[PDB]
Design a protein around this ligand. Structure first.
Ligand SMILES: CCC/C(C)=C/C=C(\C)C(=O)C1C(=O)C=C([C@H](C)CCC/C=N/C(=O)OC)OC1=O
Ligand SMILES: [Mg+2]
Ligand SMILES: [Zn+2]
Lengths: 169, 1119, 112, 226, 170, 13, 57, 95
């Protein structure tokens, strides 16, 4: 029945809510508060829970839904792409890649890879890199020291040639 | 100021209360007040009584009958201006005493049920809906009744039509078949009429030729006589054509329907249709259609005359009236009261439909109360009307008159036939019957022309919904003050004389008299006159009535005049015009703009904020002075006090001016000196030049308030917050913020500045491995939350005046679901006049300030007075709006005699009277010069020399007396401030009333470089503080094609829009100083190709040789 | 690399449709209500139509673009640009053939 | 002002300009002679009729009393000359005096309108659009394609040369010139990309898709859209 | 000719019939998806029934519905439209409507693109201008030429690089 | 010729 | 030609980006290169209102 | 107007060829700095800003100046398609 498939015990509950909303309307006169409809629901129930549920319960909205003028505009027309980077964005991160290279080029080749394997390829490396010590090499608390000197080696250069400063927005 | 009044037509009766249409339609539809419960049908009561009682009972084992006893309401849960602040609807809850009875008669009677609560009207006549001020616009539609049109698809005969007005009511058409029978339409469901001519009870063999006596070709009525015997088997053989051919065992199914009940009538208990149906057809009625409790069969007084009139029209000259569908005696206006009521009907329709369901799913003795009544169908049926109806709209309150005019509008659109059908040149068209009922000039220019329309000043809508107009009764050439409100049809019976008709006391003084005889202009002697117009005022709308010298303006341009006045923005130094018509005072009164004193008294207290008044009884009443508040349109409304402490004050005296009033007279603009002459091209094509002096006098300065909102929303990613602590490279960018996210009340805010600080968890919370490093070089934090702060958009802000904070439901606030809180910042700006601003006079001369000259450059009179504006004359001859020229002449006299004028429409000042005033004025303007020791300027002589050759001045007459001659034509000698020399030949100058016109956001200045793009289509899209692009249409595509500008067209439709990498490479190129790359294939096409593919159609781009070419390079090609 | 000079529209054979398809949609599921990740073998499956994030498999084993063009061993998702999702076709194999309505209701019914 | 009493009017203004560009049998169809000849007029109280008479040929035009004669007994009329007042049916006139004449008529008849409105525009503009109303012909005696086929004229440099000459093909294609309105003439293009872009989208594609139609982008619209 | 019959229905790439999350934890999505769903559902069921060796009458019934389901997807409303059960009796947009627009068409119109280096404003006469000139508000010129501007900024001692120049203009 | 358009249910019955 | 007048008409502005589009714009679209009408071949940029008025007087 | 529009027109057989030639000469006049120019020092386009007439940056212009001196040659099928994009990089560096 639903566009966004849902578990069965969740259709149960949704149907159980829209049941209790009926009593609580006529019981009270007004449409019940969330706290009202939670007490009625039972033991596992909560203000937040009623709300967070009904959110999930909805249709949802058709992109092809017309807007006010009806003939020419549709809901979808107004939704902006926030995935793909816009000429300004794209142009930046491409330059960044180029200027970071220019930066860590003048470094020890072993050192440069350390940071490239602490971040520069893919994974945070809380400790993982410090285990497989740059494939081969002295591990853990002696790699901790390399990060320091490598990062601090860039500060020598960067404070002087302000290239990377401006990318901090 | 002294005020000279003009013309002499005594108006025997003042203008009706102007918002009457609105205030009274509603008053008499709710009846909340004076009518106490068991009192009167008409409105919502009738809406109840027609749905209740509701039965479903078989006496023996069950029986469920639900009654209606009472209606009540009266606790708007929140104050008026509190509904505005918190985006609520100002409305009362509605209760009804119902009472359920049983087959064993459960005597237990129910009580209240506020399952349903409904919007209340403001004092002025509007509504508050979800915080917004709205106006319901009343609509014209074809009145119920019986009409006889000519056949369109036949050049010979006519069609009869019986019209009722339910949403469940049938349009019956009676015709004569191409081959002479009797076509009969119910739905589209055609059938041979005859048949029903038996079911009446009386058959073919009693009256079919006796009452159709003339009926010489009555070969449509004729047919089956053996069928026309028994009334029982009469009905049966007809239900065949109400399918799907169900047995006649419950025979009287649809005939019980179209008998008397809540369907077949056109109006309850006669009225409307019948009232006409009588004068159109026979005499009597059967109550409303055909009444029969217990007798034999069914009463016919309906079709009998109806047939015998189609007959009497297919006859020579008995009756013989083809119906004019556009006659205002055939069209009525559905007002708010009705409009809301018949929308309260569709509500109760679904209510009882939900009630009938809960007999099946329901026991018997288990549910007596309202355990079956539910609001939701009715609640949302009514909230649907007020919020989303075509007929409910954003109250236009650019200024007081905007609102007044808005409330008095009349639409042909909505649930009546609209724009698609457009019935061009019909409907859109001023009918002979509009005289005094609808303004023939006030209408929207453009494609709504003649569809929306304005109700004329003195006009009034009666209980049946017909517009009436006052005429005074004239008996034997003497004219009584006994006034009558005729409808369009009553009027057609009379010989009505015009109002300017010369009176000698009450006596008609003239030999011959101009009159209308059912629309027909005729000259008659006074013996033949039966009624007289009240005043020219009655023919026109309010807005039009505000145009002085209207009779000298062509209509097309007076339309523009009475429209532009609506768009006049309230100035801070607003003036009422030098030449007024009359209305300007009384408009402010009715518009509820200004604040008046309700009783005789003395002023106790007065500050910018409130006035307190001791009334002669001892009463101390305080009047809060609504201050610097925001109209729908962003224009300001604020009452200022015009009264001092200990001032004695009569009842109805002024206390505070509205936004657009000067001492209770409508002040929509400035009065300003205008010289009409060309000026070096700066006034070239309706464009206007402006003395910087205006700017200095704060002369066209208006105050505008913009509202900004920001939502703090819960996310799937987690909450975001209003906060002072945003992450970035600035501190001077937080200066006037401090206040815990929000900008300090009183700050000057420029475009791009921070109104409200906000941080969201962003990007599914991944920082770039590339930015990961960038950060750790600078003492990394790499924070999760993003700067989503609200900024003043480009194109300016101004200065902050109020910030308003609403939170997490808890105060009395219903927020959008998912929202934690909102913040509002209101930003005020004193818009001074500037190049681009658009000015207008009331005679539809409209232009744009193209130049602001320094006072030294401005054309000046000999006494050293410069002029304020320079209007080009070329804007007059083709426009034929000579009214402004007259306005100027009188205005010139006024300027020197220190007086203002009231010059009534088609009455008022006349050339010789102006010339007399100009003569007096000349004494001031010139008379003194000799006394102060000055003769005539050498330049004054130079000019007259040329002036007498133009034959403006008499030869031989002295320099001075020539100058007077010239001043009487309203022309002066003007010096050019650039050269000092005079302008060869005299120039008309004088005071003109001019309005600065409201500036809409759509019409504000726009510029895009590059911005957001549409998710689905990947086309430039408008952001929050980033403009969308311009639209490039096929029309523009042709212009480019016709130029052969091939590359421009290409780059317009790829790089500058659709082509994705195109637009990036383009940017990157430009930044790096390289020329733009050649564009690729635009998305528009790629997508197109995919759509067709999704339709199992192979679209295939081929090279020179017929090998396929990939347009998605690699991204589409598989494996 | 060479410029297009003709556009040709022809009927699509089932072979041609299967040709375009990057996989069969077998399940009428869309997105997962709780996690918002496209449900497997459904109308949004990354496995069929492509990655949602530029150069990143579903499970998350691969990123960087270093691995450009590799289908993942665990999650089955190609590591390319995400944009590829607006251009990649799927298909549905019908249990019984069905008539294309254009070639039936447009008169004269080209098949009739 | 003062001219609508009960006689069917000649179209005026824009509706007339359309009447031509799509033409389209006119309102008060003027009766035209189909052959050169001399005029004889017979009538009754009721019946009225014009005869055009040559040596062999002799055509009669029975016509209503409504009609306003334009021609004297004993006058000489050329094929395609109107005999009554009113607008000539172009289709009718095309059948009488062929292409050139109808084209001439269309251009002037259109001009008649614009100029009466003070509008000045070169004939060549109209002549261009008109050429396109004559774009197509209908075949009467085949070559290798079928019998009706309303179908473009300048596909004939080889195909009105293949009889004995270049490639040969038994039957030399005999065709009938054909007048059609701008609406219709526009629907009928080679470029399905354009054709689909005007009214009736589903049809065009279905047609082209079956036929495997290629569109060499010869026009502009098709190049733009791409 | 066979090809006019479908035995594999193609599927439009999801990114352009998306499933966006909008405000309030609610969603927006194309009708196609809902058209596609119900088709998949009926096909899959048809497989089961055939696999079950169900009575040919209940199979016909299924095949009927499948044919219809395909119709409804390709060109909806050439046989009595289907609608989303709740919402309203608004007919679902099929491919055919999505292509051409249901408004007869492809005219009418709904036809035009938005554009990247553009602006609009009220005009005022310029008597001073020579015939080939026009007056542009600098504020508007500055946006229209922004990228070009940014480069000159770099070529002059008024900005180190482009990011810093762009920041100057915000 | 839009006669037997919406049979489905009637048909199956 | 624009059929513009100054009662508040707005114009849209567009910017020819490329070396090529600029050449088109400048050589074939520049106002001062389009003085005669392409419909009638009569001048189109011609004295208009106040301009005539002046010169006539 | 542009300095020499009438005579620029007189130089070609189609209005549109002018535009083409000009654009393309502008494209190369940019691609190789302004080194290609067939315009002797003293006749180079000029501006005014920061107060010091530097060379006019507008290549759309430049090309039009050069055409009018007649130091250029244009034709439909002159030199081969790639014996040009390298041969022009010889005399003036592509950098
Ligand atoms: C079957 C093809 C139908 C079609 C038009 C598809 C293209 C679509 C929907 C788009 O993406 C386009 C669209 O909306 C609008 C345009 C421009 C602005 C105007 C095109 C009209 C041109 N006209 C002429 O140049 O006249 C000689 O181009 C498109 O490609
Ligand atoms: Mg205008
Ligand atoms: Zn993976």
């Amino acid at each position: 029945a639903r566009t966004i498939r849902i578990p069965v015990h969740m259709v149960e509950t949704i149907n159980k809510l829209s049941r209790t909303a009926r009593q609580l309307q006529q019981e009270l006169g007004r449409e019940p508060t969330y706290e009202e409809i939670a007490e009625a629901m039972g033991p596992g129930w909560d203000a937040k829970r009623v709300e967070e549920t009904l959110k999930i319960a909805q249709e949802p909205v058709s992109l092809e839904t017309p807007i006010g003028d009806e003939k020419d505009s549709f809901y979808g027309d107004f939704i902006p792409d926030e995935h793909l980077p816009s000429p300004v964005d794209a142009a930046t991160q491409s330059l960044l890649s180029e200027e970071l290279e220019k930066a860590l080029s003048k470094l020890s080749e072993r050192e440069a890879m350390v940071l490239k394997l602490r971040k520069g390829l893919i994974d945070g490396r809380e400790h993982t890199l410090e285990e497989v010590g740059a494939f081969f090499g002295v591990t853990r608390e002696r790699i901790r020291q390399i990060e320091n000197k490598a990062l601090r080696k860039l500060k020598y250069h960067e404070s002087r040639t302000r290239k990377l400063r401006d990318f901090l927005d | 100021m002294e005020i000279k009044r003009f013309g002499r037509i005594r108006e025997v009766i003042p203008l009706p209360p102007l918002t009457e249409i609105q205030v009274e339609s509603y008053r008499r539809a709710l009846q909340a007040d004076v009518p106490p419960e068991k009192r009167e049908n008409v409105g919502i009561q009738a809406a109840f009584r027609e749905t209740f009682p509701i039965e479903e009972e078989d006496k023996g084992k069950g029986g469920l009958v639900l009654d209606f006893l009472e209606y009540r309401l009266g606790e708007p849960p929140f104050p008026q201006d509190e509904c505005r602040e918190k985006d609520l609807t100002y409305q009362a809850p509605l209760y009804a005493r119902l009472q359920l009875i049983h087959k064993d008669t459960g005597l237990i009677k129910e009580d209240e049920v506020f399952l349903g609560h409904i919007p209340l009207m403001t004092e002025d006549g509007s509504f508050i809906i979800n915080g917004a001020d709205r106006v319901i616009v009343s609509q014209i539609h074809r009145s119920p009744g019986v009409y006889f049109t000519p056949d369109p698809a036949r050049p010979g005969r006519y069609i009869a039509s019986i019209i009722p007005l339910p949403k469940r009511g049938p349009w019956i058409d009676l015709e004569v078949e191409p081959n002479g029978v009797v076509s009969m339409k119910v739905n589209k469901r055609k059938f041979p009429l005859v048949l029903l001519l038996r079911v009446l009870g009386y058959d073919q063999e009693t009256l079919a030729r006796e009452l159709g006596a003339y009926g010489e070709l009555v070969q449509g009525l004729m047919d089956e006589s053996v069928f026309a015997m028994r009334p029982e088997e009469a009905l049966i053989r007809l239900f065949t054509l109400l399918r799907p051919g169900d047995p006649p065992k419950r025979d009287k199914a649809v005939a019980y329907v179209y008998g008397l009940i809540a369907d077949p009538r056109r109006y309850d208990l006669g009225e409307a249709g019948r009232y006409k149906a009588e004068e159109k057809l026979g005499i009597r009625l059967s109550g409303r259609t055909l009444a029969r409790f217990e007798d034999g069969e069914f009463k016919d007084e309906v079709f009998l005359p109806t047939l015998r009139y189609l007959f009497a029209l297919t006859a020579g000259v008995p009756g013989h009236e083809v119906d004019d569908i556009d006659h205002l005696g055939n069209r009525r206006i559905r007002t708010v009261g009705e409009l809301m009521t018949d929308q309260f009907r569709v509500g109760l329709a679904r209510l009882a439909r939900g009630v009938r369901e809960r007999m099946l799913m329901g026991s018997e003795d288990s549910l007596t109360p309202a355990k079956l009544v539910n609001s939701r169908p009715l609640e949302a049926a009514i909230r649907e009307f007020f919020s989303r109806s075509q007929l409910s709209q954003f109250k236009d309150e650019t200024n007081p008159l905007s609102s007044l005019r808005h409330k008095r509008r009349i639409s042909a659109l909505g649930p009546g036939g609209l724009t698609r059908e457009r019935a061009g040149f019909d409907v859109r068209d001023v009918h002979r019957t509009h005289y005094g009922r609808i303004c023939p000039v006030e209408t929207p220019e453009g494609a709504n022309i003649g569809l929306i329309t304005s109700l004329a000043a003195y006009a009034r809508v009666d209980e049946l919904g017909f517009i009436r107009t006052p005429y005074r009764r004239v008996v034997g050439g003497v004219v009584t003050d006994e006034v009558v409100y005729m409808t369009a049809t009553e009027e057609d019976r009379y010989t009505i004389a015009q109002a300017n008709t010369p009176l000698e006391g009450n006596r008609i003084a003239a030999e011959r008299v101009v009159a209308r005889r059912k629309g027909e202009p005729v000259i008659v002697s006074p013996e033949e006159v039966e009624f007289m117009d009240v005043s020219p005022k009655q023919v026109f709308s309010v807005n039009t009535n505000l145009i002085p010298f209207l009779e000298h303006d062509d209509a097309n341009r007076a339309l523009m005049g009475s429209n532009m006045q609506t768009q006049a923005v309230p100035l801070i130094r607003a003036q009422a015009p030098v030449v007024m018509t009359g209305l300007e005072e009384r408009v402010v009164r009715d518009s509820l703009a200004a604040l008046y004193a309700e009783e005789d008294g003395e002023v106790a207290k007065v500050d910018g904020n409130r006035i307190v008044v001791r009334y002669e009884d001892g009463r101390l009443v305080e009047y809060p002075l609504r201050r610097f508040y925001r109209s729908n349109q962003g224009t300001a409304l604020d009452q200022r006090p015009r009264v001092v402490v200990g001032q004695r004050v009569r009842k109805g005296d002024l206390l505070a001016d509205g936004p657009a009033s000067e001492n209770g007279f409508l002040a929509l603009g400035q009065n300003v000196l205008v010289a009409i002459m060309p000026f070096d091209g700066y006034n070239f094509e309706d464009a206007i030049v402006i003395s910087e002096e205006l700017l200095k006098r704060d002369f066209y300065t208006s105050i505008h308030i913009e509202r900004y909102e920001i939502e703090a929303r819960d996310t799937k990613l987690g909450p975001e917050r209003i906060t002072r602590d945003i992450p970035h490279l600035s501190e001077a960018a937080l200066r006037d913020l401090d206040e815990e996210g929000v900008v300090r009340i009183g700050a000057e805010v420029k475009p791009g500045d921070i109104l409200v600080g906000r941080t969201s968890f962003k990007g599914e919370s991944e920082p770039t491995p590339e930015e990961r490093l960038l950060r750790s070089i600078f003492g990394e934090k790499a924070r999760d939350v993003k700067d989503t702060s609200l900024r003043v958009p480009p194109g300016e802000g101004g200065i902050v005046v109020r910030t308003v904070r609403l939170r997490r439901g808890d105060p009395g606030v219903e927020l959008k679901p998912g929202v934690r809180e909102v913040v509002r910042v209101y930003v005020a700006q004193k818009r001074k006049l500037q190049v681009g601003d658009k000015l207008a006079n009331r005679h539809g001369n409209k232009g744009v300030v193209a130049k602001i000259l320094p006072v030294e450059d401005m054309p000046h009179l000999p006494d050293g007075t410069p002029v304020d504006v320079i209007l080009n004359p070329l804007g007059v001859p083709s426009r034929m709006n000579l009214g402004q020229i007259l306005e100027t002449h009188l205005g010139l006299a006024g300027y020197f005699l220190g007086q203002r004028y009231i010059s009534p429409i088609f009455d008022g000042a006349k050339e010789p009277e102006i010339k007399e005033l100009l003569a007096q004025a000349f004494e001031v303007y010139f008379g003194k010069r000799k006394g102060e020791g000055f003769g005539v300027d050498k330049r004054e002589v130079e000019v007259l020399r040329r002036a007498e050759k133009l034959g403006l001045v008499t030869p031989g007459k002295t320099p001075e007396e020539q100058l007077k001659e010239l001043f009487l034509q309203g022309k002066v000698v003007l010096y050019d401030g650039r050269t000092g020399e005079p302008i060869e030949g005299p120039i008309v100058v004088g005071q003109m009333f001019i309005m600065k016109l409201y500036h809409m956001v759509e019409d504000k200045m726009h510029a895009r470089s590059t911005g957001p793009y549409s998710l689905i289509t990947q086309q430039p899209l408008g952001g929050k503080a980033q403009f969308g692009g311009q639209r490039f249409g096929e029309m523009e595509v042709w212009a480019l094609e016709a130029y052969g500008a091939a590359h421009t067209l290409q780059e317009m439709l790829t790089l500058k829009s659709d082509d994705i990498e195109g637009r990036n490479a383009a940017y990157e190129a430009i930044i790096k100083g390289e020329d733009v790359p050649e564009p690729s294939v635009p998305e528009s096409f790629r997508v197109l190709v995919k759509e067709l593919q999704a339709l199992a159609l192979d679209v295939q781009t081929l090279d020179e040789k017929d090998n396929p070419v990939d347009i998605f390079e690699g991204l589409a090609s598989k494996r | 690399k060479k410029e297009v000079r003709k556009v040709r529209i022809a009927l699509a054979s089932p072979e041609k449709i299967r040709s375009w398809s990057y996989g069969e949609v077998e399940k009428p599921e869309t997105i997962n209500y709780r996690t918002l990740k496209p449900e497997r073998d459904g109308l949004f499956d990354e496995r069929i139509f492509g990655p949602i994030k530029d150069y990143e498999c579903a499970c998350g084993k691969y990123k960087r673009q270093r691995f450009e063009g590799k289908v993942c061993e665990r999650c089955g998702v190609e590591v390319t640009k995400s944009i590829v999702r607006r251009y990649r076709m799927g298909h549905i194999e019908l249990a019984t053939p069905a008539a294309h309505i254009w070639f039936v209701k447009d008169v004269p019914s080209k098949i009739g | 002002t003062g001219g609508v009493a009960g006689a069917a009017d000649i179209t005026q203004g824009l509706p007339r300009v359309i009447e031509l560009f799509e033409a389209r049998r006119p309102k008060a169809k003027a009766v035209i002679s189909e052959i050169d000849g001399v005029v004889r007029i017979e009538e009754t109280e009721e019946k009225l009729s014009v005869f055009v008479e040559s040596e062999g040929f002799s055509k009669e035009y029975k016509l209503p009393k409504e009609a306003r004669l334009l021609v004297k007994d004993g006058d000489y009329v050329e094929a395609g000359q109107p005999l009554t007042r009113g607008a000539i049916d172009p289709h009718q006139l095309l059948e009488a005096k062929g292409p050139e004449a109808v084209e001439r008529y269309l251009v002037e008849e259109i001009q008649k309108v614009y100029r009466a409105q003070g509008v000045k525009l070169h004939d060549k503009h109209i002549e261009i659009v008109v050429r396109q109303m004559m774009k197509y012909v209908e075949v009467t005696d085949p070559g290798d394609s079928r019998l009706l086929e309303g179908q473009v004229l300048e596909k004939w440099d080889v195909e009105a040369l293949n009889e004995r000459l270049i490639a040969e093909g038994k039957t030399p294609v005999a065709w009938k010139p054909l007048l059609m309105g701008v609406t219709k003439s526009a629907l009928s293009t080679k470029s399905w990309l354009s054709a689909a872009s005007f009214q009736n989208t589903t049809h065009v594609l279905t047609e082209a898709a079956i036929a495997g139609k290629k569109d060499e982008l010869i026009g502009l619209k098709e190049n733009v859209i791409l | 000719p066979e090809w006019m019959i479908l035995e594999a229905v193609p599927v439009l790439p999801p990114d352009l019939r998306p499933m966006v999350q909008v405000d309030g934890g609610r969603f927006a999505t194309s009708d196609l998806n809902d058209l596609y769903r119900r088709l998949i559902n009926r096909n899959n069921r048809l497989k089961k029934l055939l696999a079950q060796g169900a009575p040919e009458i209940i199979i016909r019934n299924e095949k009927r519905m499948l044919q219809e389901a395909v119709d409804a997807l390709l060109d909806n409303g050439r046989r009595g439209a289907p609608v989303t059960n709740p919402g309203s009796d608004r007919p679902l947009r099929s491919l055919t409507d999505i292509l051409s627009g249901k408004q007869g068409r492809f005219r009418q119109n709904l036809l035009g693109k938005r554009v990247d280096y553009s602006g609009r404003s009220v005009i005022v006469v310029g008597p001073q201008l020579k015939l080939h000139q026009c007056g542009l508000p600098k504020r508007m010129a500055l946006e229209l030429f922004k990228p070009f501007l940014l480069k000159k900024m770099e070529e002059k001692g008024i900005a180190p690089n482009v990011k810093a120049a762009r920041r100057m203009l915000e | 010729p839009k006669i037997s358009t919406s049979d489905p249910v009637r048909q199956y019955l | 030609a624009f059929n513009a007048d100054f009662d508040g008409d707005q114009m849209a502005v567009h910017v020819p980006l490329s070396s090529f589009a600029q050449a088109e714009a400048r050589i074939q679209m520049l106002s001062a290169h389009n003085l005669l009408s392409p419909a009638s071949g009569e001048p189109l940029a011609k004295p208009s209102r106040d301009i005539i008025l002046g010169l006539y007087y | 107007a542009e300095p020499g529009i009438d005579k620029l027109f007189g130089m070609v057989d189609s209005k549109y060829r002018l535009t083409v030639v000009v654009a393309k000469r502008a494209q190369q006049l940019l691609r190789h700095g302004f080194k290609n120019t067939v315009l002797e020092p003293e006749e180079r386009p000029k501006m005014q800003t920061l107060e010091g007439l530097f060379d006019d940056p507008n290549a759309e212009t430049w090309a039009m100046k050069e055409l009018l001196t007649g130091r250029l040659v244009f034709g439909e099928n002159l030199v081969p398609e790639d014996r040009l994009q390298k041969e022009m990089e010889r005399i003036y560096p592509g950098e």
